[PDB]
Amino acid sequence: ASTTLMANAIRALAMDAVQQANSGHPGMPMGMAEIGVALWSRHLKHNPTNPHWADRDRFVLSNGHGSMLLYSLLHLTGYDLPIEELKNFRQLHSKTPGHPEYGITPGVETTTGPLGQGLANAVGMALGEALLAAEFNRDDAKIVDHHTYVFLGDGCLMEGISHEACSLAGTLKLNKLIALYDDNGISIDGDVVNWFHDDTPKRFEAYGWNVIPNVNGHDVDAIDAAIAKAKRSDKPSLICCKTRIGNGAATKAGGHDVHGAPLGADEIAKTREALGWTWAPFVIPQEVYAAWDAKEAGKRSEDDWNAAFAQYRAKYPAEAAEFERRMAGTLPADWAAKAAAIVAGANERGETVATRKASQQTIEGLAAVLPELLGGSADLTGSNLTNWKASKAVRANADGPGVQWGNHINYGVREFGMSAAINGLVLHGGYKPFGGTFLTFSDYSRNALRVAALMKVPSIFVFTHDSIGLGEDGPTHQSVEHVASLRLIPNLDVWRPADTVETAVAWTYAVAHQHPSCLIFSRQNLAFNARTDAQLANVEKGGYVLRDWDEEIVARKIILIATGSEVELAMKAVEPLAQQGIAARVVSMPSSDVFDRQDAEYRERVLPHGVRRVAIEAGVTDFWRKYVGLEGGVVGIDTFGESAPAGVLFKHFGFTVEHVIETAKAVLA
Amino acid sequence: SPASTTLMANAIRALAMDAVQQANSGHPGMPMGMAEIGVALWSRHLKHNPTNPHWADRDRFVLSNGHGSMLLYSLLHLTGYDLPIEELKNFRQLHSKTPGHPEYGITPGVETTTGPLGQGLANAVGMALGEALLAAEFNRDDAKIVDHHTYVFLGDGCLMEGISHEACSLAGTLKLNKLIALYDDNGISIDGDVVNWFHDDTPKRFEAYGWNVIPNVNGHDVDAIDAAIAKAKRSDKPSLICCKTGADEIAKTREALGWTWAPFVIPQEVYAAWDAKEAGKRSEDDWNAAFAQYRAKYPAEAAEFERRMAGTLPADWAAKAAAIVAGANERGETVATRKASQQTIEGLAAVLPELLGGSADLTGSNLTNWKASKAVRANADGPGVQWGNHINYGVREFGMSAAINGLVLHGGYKPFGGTFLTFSDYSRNALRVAALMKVPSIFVFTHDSIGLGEDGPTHQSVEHVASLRLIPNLDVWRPADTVETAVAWTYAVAHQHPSCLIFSRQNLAFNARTDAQLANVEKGGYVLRDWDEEIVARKIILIATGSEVELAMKAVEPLAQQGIAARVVSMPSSDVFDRQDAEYRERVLPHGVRRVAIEAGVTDFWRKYVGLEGGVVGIDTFGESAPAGVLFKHFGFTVEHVIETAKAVLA
């Protein structure tokens, strides 16, 4: 059963599943068929029966629209993806969505579709493998050794994020990363040369990559040999595979309408004749299956690694335990107590610091407790305060390929690439990564935060300099809409702590839960608040009563809802409001997302139905309408900022006791 | 003796370190590092008139590295722009003309607003593209009126950002040879020595883009930088010039430099060596005379150039906009609002010669092109572009969006560019900066919800419409049909806020409108179907946008059969609706009549109109991969769910 027959198999499933769904992208799976045979048949180290096998090569389909390529490969090689599913391509609840989705389909390593990000994910996975290896291998016993393969097309290469990820990968000498490029002269608008005339080999050599240019992308033997050559490189490798889009189509190969549209029944019948593929839709003859199936080889590969690991466990019982725990993403055994100790510690200290500082202090405590902690900053380490006393900066080896182990990464000025890479580090397993930048620059990395939320993986994204409180850098740096815009992304937890204790709570919560988190810290100092034991336990509920009414008040009730640096203002507002006949309960809402997940009883306790509310936050006001209603009030900022000291701006922009009072009287009128 | 270049440069170092000391805030190192580059460019090559920063044929300068803003302030102050020393003393103070990062519109001679890295460079690319397009369009064999360079100062941060890749790759494919980038190659970014995280061979990278690179220029040798700029001007390719560059410390720097003068004191001869008013006036005078000769030979073109450089619409615009809108209403067509968008683009292009469209590799999907357009293309043999009015930007959303900002700043075109709505997350900060700059950039977004169907949750926007509404001063439109599309487009084109125009993949039903309703569409929110004149049924308001307006209209008779009388408010733009006066807003949404919002995106946004007691038919999860009709039923976009919600709200 020839490789033509094996490649053609991919062609038939891709074209027939697209036609069936009358939707999707047949051109790339047909263009890349032989590349598929080359990598998957002759090189990929994997086990269909266990797609969670720790030491498997990681494959990433960065050009995610060509998803039938992956579904064919998963199906053909014997993963648990039955033919029924490929028949249900692009149908509700199928295991075959239009773009591949992590957690939905076995063997799907990450979620792609937004261009460029799969490639950045793959850099993160290569970084994970390289870091773990440096960490867990011993001169007399290796348990970490796998490559990271990524398919990509012209789209990914035009996206800025390819630049960020490949520059970093080159500087970090990630030589087990191997990229195969669907080099076909085509993107969606037509002939790529009219908008994209890069000398791509030259670009990639400039990054410190090895490039294998001009491979015949329809020659299984040629691609195979190029991968072998890549596999022996001192540098990450780009393989340039010259292909024809929809190659094998009877009449439409190389056309500009095979990217994202069905071929039609007529072209499909004629393609069956030209290829000699005699089988009906979704019929695959057993000799194609026998040539593609990897269950046997997979079993052998993984059983071998198990023996390899068992021998490792004998010589290093403690490290083997740690590896298994970390690969599984399980926290230490004494977690609740150590986490409660970090929080108690902050509460005991009672210091008024910037929550960026509170953050660094929490990281100190997390690190002493989580060897898996992997920090980093997008060239703002000194500003974000993401590194800690005992941390080691990850660096490429001076002389050979690979990295020296470390646990804080300087990502460079690459917020988007850092964020996608973090998603890769997380998906790889073995570390608990986070990475920082200024809050406003969440606008550069936004879709990566989004993709973490879609995948439901606990990526942590740290943002500092969160408002006009940052002062003089001015309105291009001063976030106004950002905090609310991140809340709005489904499944993304947003924390904006008021003090050292809310920071400690936010971090330990984030490290321990399944949602990706944005942790949002201030530049400037925020007053410490004191809390009851009951209150300390309620911070983890996202919103809690920081200060209640006294039974002895018997004046007009209001609820002040505040977050982050504005908790101080709500708190300073209480007595002045009392002296005006208003009794103010202060609710601190460090995470509205976590608060919204609470039960109805708890939410009613904190925000009693029918008591009016004023929300206080140095951000856009409309967001708070969900808690304060049409009749409630908001003290916030609905314009861009200005360049001036923080104290000047806070006054200028009406974050004053006087404004809080004025608003409260207006709400209660 | 007249000022040496060393004294000319040290004047910059003095102002930078003194302004920073005065403000006790900011970064003196970058301006001080780039001072010689400043002298070489501004004093020897920059063509500009300090007395008129709006001279149409001026060279364009961009400080892409926003941190060294005292470099620019020094340069503007020294060469004679209207930026007094009292302002430099007021660095980083409230309402000064010397903000922390430079701001377009605040300070004369500031061409764009920079701060987030890489975007200035993308801005510059869009300005160079503007100059090349105008020239190809307007210059004649016997009379040239367009001819200027675009210069950008650049640092390591800018080069690491993915947006430099998008912008520089495009500039190199388009052979924008009048773009000249000068790179502060100092070995340093904020975290320390760049080599640990940025070890690019930047020269080879840029040659791979089709740029000319002059590597290894001594960043402190004015003559060397000068000659390097001179060479770049002879190049057939855009050029990158790689320039290798409190109290006690300031006092000792003064001594090390032999700068004897007190803070903010510039000696007369340094002023005289930097002043550019006299060369400026001559340059602009020469140009005004070359323009008079152009006007004598090409009077219609000359008036069109002037109108378009001011960004003024045609004098009978109100009639021409009304004809576009009326033709939409007359046609009564049920199509996707992406198709409605293309139809309006077509009518706009026939009356706006300045119209300049494009798409980030989604031309067919977004429908941004029109039948009479010409595609912008590099010249086959020489540098530069053949003129066109539709640009294939490649798969570069952020770079396209920042380039558009630069095209808008340059003057002469009315540009817009398209991509899918979710991919607004890639270009977001450029949307933000347009809104901060107050410039009428037009961003087109299509495929706006689960209505796109099978492509699935990575493409299906859910939070995007509401998250863009949050951005101050950015107008968001999500028209229900061809008439709301024509209104949104003609309003966006005519007004000063940047606009996001949000279009559906799928067919949306046309809605008939009375005259009074047609006149209210441009108010952003309006009554599309009102309650009967005297009724006994309980009242609800349905507020809907986009594709959901059809769902609101379909719910009205079913609601009436349940004893519920529904007003349908269409809200194509909540942002424009919020700028309406209190009387109008109360007329559309009367106090104390309860509301249900309907919109295929996050629900929380609507709480500002429907309150805690109101209702929302929306989606607060990600989508799924399935046909659009299957998804809409799956996600509860149904009359039955509208009725349930309305009854629960009315309870």
Ligand SMILES: [Cl-]
């Ligand atoms: Cl592709």
